[PDB]
Design a protein around this ligand. Structure first.
Ligand SMILES: Cc1cc(N)c2ccccc2[n+]1CCCCCCCCCC[n+]1c(C)cc(N)c2ccccc21
Lengths: 186, 186
């Protein structure tokens, strides 16, 4: 494909280097397409990156729906989602690139809108789990949105800031975190 | 002292122009030193920057040592340290150079090793709060080292990935997080 091999080489570059480290020159010299091509579907470079995120959050959310069956209670789904978070090949590997990205486009207005459209997708899985768990009598959260937002970011914190220590050490901490947290809700 | 003039000047240069754009030549001339002296004390730009981070971590510890006295109990120190990490990062000028430097050097083991020492010093403050809270009966935690690493990265996530929200909402969520988490310990 064309408008799909771009998105591919781009994802690979944003991860391998960083957001700025990868230039449109590079994406082209390895995705072979005149500068203009990258201009139709993808208006700007911040469009191509914001595009990659959407796909990634979708592939990830999709992977979780196909794996969440292995958890019977919402309590178990919480532990599971946070554990799988450390291993997916989806979305989470772009978090550094996203931190970089936001530091260099937070002076524009169309940024806080798109970076907040994704926010809703990103915390959705937690919203389901906490609401569904309210319905299933697993706990009683008065402010579901607040808690989903906290859970999502705290977890994104664990996944992102421990990216060097042995993987099983990380799963261990994440489980202790999921424990402290749900225990905190009831 | 010349070493300190070099560090002071380099810090300001990194802040005004960012990590990559600052040249050691600028650092050399503006501090009235030499490539030789700079090489002698730091070996490289990356090292210089890491040394600056060291000093910054120490000033931060000193500031905390003076601030925590406002918080009688450890439950309070925890609430306060988490709020301080969120509010003071909003206007910490080196933050930008820091993002730029990390999301570009976490691949090297030389650098990522030294960064971990820094990170570990930040985590220590949680260790102290948690150990001290044990000896005071504020809670009973059997795995202080672990809970400390979890708290630190959870908080960093909340501080780091929540930037699009309004400042009061972020402070509301950080406190709710502190409340949930401290409640999950008992
Ligand atoms: C004085 C002073 C004054 C303040 N008002 C202040 C305010 C807020 C914070 C520190 C402050 N300090 C001093 C602060 C010194 C901070 C030194 C930090 C070193 C390490 C960064 C580690 N790191 C890791 C592990 C993992 C990541 N994925 C990652 C991603 C992006 C960026 C960094 C990353």
């Amino acid at each position: 494909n064309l408008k799909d091999k771009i998105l591919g080489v781009a994802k690979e570059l944003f991860i391998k280097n960083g957001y700025n480290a990868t230039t449109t020159g590079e994406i082209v010299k390895l995705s072979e397409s005149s500068k203009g091509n990258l201009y139709y579907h993808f208006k700007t470079k911040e469009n191509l990156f914001l595009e990659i995120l959407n796909i990634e959050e979708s592939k990830w959310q999709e992977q979780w729906k196909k794996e969440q069956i292995k958890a019977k209670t919402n309590r178990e789904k919480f532990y599971l989602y946070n554990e799988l978070s450390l291993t997916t090949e989806y979305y989470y590997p772009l978090q550094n690139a996203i931190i970089e990205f936001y530091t260099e486009y937070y002076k524009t207005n169309s940024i806080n809108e798109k970076m907040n459209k994704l926010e809703n997708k990103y915390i959705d899985a937690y919203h389901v789990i906490f609401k569904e768990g309210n319905l299933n009598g697993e706990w009683s959260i008065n402010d579901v949105n607040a808690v989903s937002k906290i859970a999502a970011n705290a977890v994104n914190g664990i996944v992102t800031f421990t990216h060097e220590q042995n993987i099983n050490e990380r799963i261990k901490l994440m489980n202790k975190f999921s424990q402290i947290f749900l225990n905190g809700l009831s």
